[PDB]
């Protein structure tokens, strides 16, 4: 199952100044970038056009080019309309795309956040507010839902274009999507409010699923704390696993790493 996510972030500093920047993800791989400074959407993979013909891509891009300009003016007009309820600066984020399931099934979504809070989605044939959203948004929703042309275009974009485009991406991008990159590990230590803290560093692995445990022989140390997954710049992952121990208790300890890329040959590092 892969989630395709188009992420738009728009800053409005005052009546005149604004910028809109977009990134596109298929799972955890970036497929597109669209900087405010650029007239055109940039591919960040050789296969970013999917299975769309040049004419189909050109047509899709043109729709987005009109959208970006139109969006910018509409927000500025909605601010005037709700004035002085809402003032600049304003941040609007959109998260749109589809999740792909087996058997040619998918679900599409278009979620909108205002000043960092999810307030609005497109659902069915119209815009709606979601639970918790402020009441003033009822007027913008009324205005947005008057635009039958936008509703018809968005319906087609979510229902048809997104899944068709993404199915093509999954075919074209298969060998990047299914890449296996091996982790490399190393050990280190620091003090921690006392006691020592051993660190097992694991870096360069893809895809994300990984297993890392501190161990004495065959005894999995239950005090092992996995950190967050941190990205490397080359579309691999970094993770560290810590263990709090007593000074002089380090002997016997090892760090074991399981990953799909190692083909059963685990990494074992003895302190």
């Amino acid at each position: 199952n892969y989630t395709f996510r188009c992420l738009q972030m728009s800053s409005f500093a005052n009546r005149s100044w604004s910028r809109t920047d977009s990134v596109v993800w298929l799972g955890d791989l970036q497929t597109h970038r669209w900087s405010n400074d650029s007239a055109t959407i940039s591919f960040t993979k050789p296969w970013s056009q999917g299975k769309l013909s040049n004419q189909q891509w050109e047509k899709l891009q043109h729709m987005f080019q009109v959208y970006r300009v139109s969006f910018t003016r509409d927000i500025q007009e909605l601010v005037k309309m709700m004035s002085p309820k809402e003032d600049y600066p304003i941040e609007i984020q959109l998260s749109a795309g589809c999740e792909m399931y087996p058997g040619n099934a998918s679900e599409s979504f278009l979620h909108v956040a205002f000043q960092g809070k999810y307030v609005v989605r497109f659902w069915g044939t119209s815009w709606q507010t979601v639970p918790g959203a402020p009441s003033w948004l009822d007027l913008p929703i009324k205005v947005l839902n008057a635009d039958q042309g936008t509703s018809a275009t968005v319906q087609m974009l979510l229902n048809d274009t997104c899944p068709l485009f993404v199915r093509g991406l999954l075919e074209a991008g298969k060998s990047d999507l299914e890449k296996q990159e091996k982790p490399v590990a190393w050990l280190s230590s620091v003090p921690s409010s006392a006691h020592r803290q051993l660190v097992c560093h694991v870096s360069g692995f893809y895809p994300k699923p990984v297993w890392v445990m501190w161990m004495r022989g065959d005894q999995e140390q239950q005090g092992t704390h996995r950190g967050d997954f941190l990205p490397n710049a080359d579309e691999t992952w970094y993770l560290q696993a810590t263990l709090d121990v007593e000074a002089g208790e380090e002997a016997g300890l090892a760090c074991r790493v399981k990953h799909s890329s190692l083909g059963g040959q685990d990494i074992i590092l003895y302190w």
């Epitope: 009109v66 309309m81 205005v143 635009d147």
Partner: T-cell receptor, first 113, second 111 residues
Amino acid sequence: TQVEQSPQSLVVRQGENCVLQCNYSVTPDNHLRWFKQDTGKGLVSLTVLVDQKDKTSNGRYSATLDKDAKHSTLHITATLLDDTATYICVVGDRGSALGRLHFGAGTQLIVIP
Amino acid sequence: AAVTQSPRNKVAVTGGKVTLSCNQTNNHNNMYWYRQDTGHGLRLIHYSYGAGSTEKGDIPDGYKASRPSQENFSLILELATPSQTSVYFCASGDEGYTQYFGPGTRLLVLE
């Protein structure tokens, strides 16, 4: 301007047909309206065209829109004296009140009785 | 959906104050002032999204707008000039794209 009408003016004899043109560069183009404006009077809507390729009719008036060419024509069949007026093309850039209207400068028709 | 304008015709002198009024009983949030001059399409001066709102259009200079109520939208020429000799049209609308136009006001500003 983003909306251009042709001809600027024309004179026809009663009973003759005529065709008025509207070309625009407005983007986007949600809909296009034709107005009739009699001398010293206000704007009377004749038709509104909304589809990518659209055709409408209203008695002796018929109109086409081609959004790909950004072009509309208004046809008047069997002109009458009362068709003497200015005919104005307007493009609305949104399907809502967030839209701006872009007005052409009009075509003056005179019908000789 | 009807819209009225007053006065329908006005002769004014340069430097004088002129107020053009538009009234609308449709309970429309949105009202719009335009001027029409030979050789040009209608051009937007000021508009309003409700009582207390006024917004600059494409050619606002020399005009002030006033929206005291849902019903009334005024165009005020504080210091009238001959360049403001024109036909002025008011319109109103709701969330839909249609603007419902008034019958027009003819203004002549003499020196």
